[PDB]
Scaffold this motif. Structure first.
Motif, PDB file in Angstrom:
ATOM      1  N   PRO A   1       0.779  -1.244   0.000  1.00  0.00           N
ATOM      2  CA  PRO A   1       0.000   0.000   0.000  1.00  0.00           C
ATOM      3  C   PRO A   1       0.812   1.297   0.000  1.00  0.00           C
ATOM      4  CG  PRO A   1      -1.224  -1.604   1.175  1.00  0.00           C
ATOM      5  CD  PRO A   1       0.091  -2.280   0.796  1.00  0.00           C
ATOM      6  N   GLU A   2       0.465   2.174  -0.940  1.00  0.00           N
ATOM      7  CA  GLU A   2       1.119   3.469  -1.135  1.00  0.00           C
ATOM      8  C   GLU A   2       1.197   4.398   0.082  1.00  0.00           C
ATOM      9  OE1 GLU A   2       0.783   6.997  -4.415  1.00  0.00           O
ATOM     10  OE2 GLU A   2      -1.080   6.135  -3.632  1.00  0.00           O
ATOM     11  N   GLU A   3       2.404   4.900   0.328  1.00  0.00           N
ATOM     12  CA  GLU A   3       2.674   5.802   1.442  1.00  0.00           C
ATOM     13  C   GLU A   3       2.256   7.249   1.143  1.00  0.00           C
ATOM     14  OE1 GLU A   3       3.579   5.099   4.634  1.00  0.00           O
ATOM     15  OE2 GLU A   3       3.021   7.228   4.724  1.00  0.00           O
ATOM     16  N   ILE A   4       1.343   7.783   1.950  1.00  0.00           N
ATOM     17  CA  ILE A   4       0.867   9.147   1.759  1.00  0.00           C
ATOM     18  C   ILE A   4       1.019  10.028   2.999  1.00  0.00           C
ATOM     19  CG2 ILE A   4      -1.202  10.567   1.371  1.00  0.00           C
ATOM     20  CD1 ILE A   4      -1.940   8.889  -0.918  1.00  0.00           C
ATOM     21  N   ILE A   5       1.520  11.243   2.790  1.00  0.00           N
ATOM     22  CA  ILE A   5       1.733  12.205   3.869  1.00  0.00           C
ATOM     23  C   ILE A   5       1.352  13.615   3.401  1.00  0.00           C
ATOM     24  CG2 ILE A   5       4.179  12.156   3.194  1.00  0.00           C
ATOM     25  CD1 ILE A   5       4.820  13.235   6.048  1.00  0.00           C
TER      26      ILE A   5
END
Length: 379
Positions: A349-353
């Motif tokens: 799962p893609e890391e988002i910040i």
């Protein structure tokens, strides 16, 4: 007619910028470090190993075909020009294609691919998963000079993995005018969504290329150019005039030619340049962006036309990702990117910040190649 490498560098950078745009819109103030150039070279290779409608979708979205006359040798001159010693600062680019050792390849694919990318398909056995994974992860590590290690986690490769396309990009450049260790100070509470932090800060007063931009919706942004010592590359910075003005107002019109125009309207003005000292590591999933741009088939098991590579068994891309790592400090910038298109596997799962951010662009001015882009926090 124009200089072939410049024509291609624009087509690539334009495509690469359009996908970054999709990435940005798929979040609020997403702190993301991307590489427009890196996502373009892999998709150029994916132009050969694919066919039919799938290929056409890729070509349409890219604006060109590597198989066209001149395109291929042009794109190679570009690498050569970006990697030359005369740039002083260092960029390095390597492409690779790892194919399942026993997959029956279409006659002519391999000989053709070599005459376009001057490289041979590395044939690996994906059955011995941990060995195959090591083989490619180690390739990335040496080509990103140790910056990107472990591009592939465990569930990223299995016995069903038939193909993996990879691009390795490295950039190590020193500031033309270093920031003084004197003005380097910590800033407090970046208003981070959660608590307080001590953001190092760098500052310097000097003459910088600058222009004042106003987005179609009447929003003021100040673009500043920060050169690297060989004078061929520079980092453009863009921050809004007022904090109420959302950065998204800029990214929604952002293009490779807009950046071009920015350069064409700057003047050497005296300014106080404050820039946060950062290290940012980020991994993006390019499925939605590429789909959004119009390349759907390659992701669908039953319509993904990979016939120019193998008619033996139907194939479709499982994951398209890009891992970028960048370090900006007093002396310069060191960045790396690893873009990979993988056939059958699972993506963590893609890391988002998110946080108030500012935009940056690392560009090779002679050719017009935007190597990196980002949205880092702004204290």
């Amino acid at each position: 007619v124009h200089h072939p490498p410049s024509y291609v560098a624009h087509l690539a950078s334009d495509f690469g910028v359009r996908v970054f745009q999709q990435v940005a819109q798929a979040s609020k103030d997403r702190n993301v470090v991307f590489s427009p150039y890196g996502v373009a070279s892999v998709l150029a290779m994916l132009q050969l190993t694919t066919g039919g409608e799938t290929q056409q979708q890729i070509q349409a979205a890219m604006g060109f075909k590597i198989d066209d006359k001149g395109m291929a040798p042009a794109l190679r001159h570009l690498y050569k020009e970006l990697m030359g010693p005369w740039n002083k600062d260092e960029i390095s680019t390597t492409d690779a294609i790892f194919v399942q050792r026993d997959l029956k390849l279409v006659q002519g694919f391999m000989p053709h691919f070599f005459r376009l990318f001057r490289s041979t398909v590395k044939q690996v056995d994906f059955s011995e998963v941990e060995r195959a994974r090591f083989i490619i992860n180690d390739w990335v590590k040496t080509h990103t000079k140790g910056m990107i290690s472990n591009l592939l986690g465990k569930g990223a490769v299995d016995q069903l993995t038939r193909l993996v396309l990879v691009n390795a990009l490295y950039f190590n450049g020193q500031w033309k005018t270093p920031f003084p260790d004197s003005s380097t100070h910590r800033r407090l509470f970046h208003k981070s969504d959660g608590s307080t932090v001590s953001v190092p800060m760098m500052a310097q007063t000097n003459k910088f290329n600058y222009t004042e931009f106003t987005t179609p919706d009447g929003h003021y942004y100040d673009i500043l150019e920060l050169p690297y010592h060989g004078d061929t590359l520079s980092m453009f910075i863009a921050a809004p005039y007022e904090k109420e003005v959302p950065l998204s107002a800029l990214t929604n019109i952002l293009s490779a030619q807009l950046i071009s125009h920015w350069k064409g309207n700057m003047t050497r003005l005296p300014r106080l340049l404050v820039l946060p000292k950062f290290s940012l590591e980020t991994e993006v999933d390019l499925r939605k962006p590429l789909e959004n741009l119009g390349m759907t088939d390659m992701f669908r098991q039953f319509q993904a036309d990979f016939t120019s590579l193998s008619d033996q068994e139907p194939l479709h891309v499982a994951q398209a990702l890009q891992k970028v790592k960048i370090e900006v400090n007093e002396s310069g910038t060191v960045a790396s990117s690893s873009t990979a298109v993988i056939v059958s596997a699972r993506m963590a799962p893609e890391e988002i910040i998110m946080d108030r951010p500012f935009l940056f662009v690392v560009r090779h001015n002679p050719t017009g190649t935007v190597l990196f882009m980002g949205q880092v926090m702004e204290p």
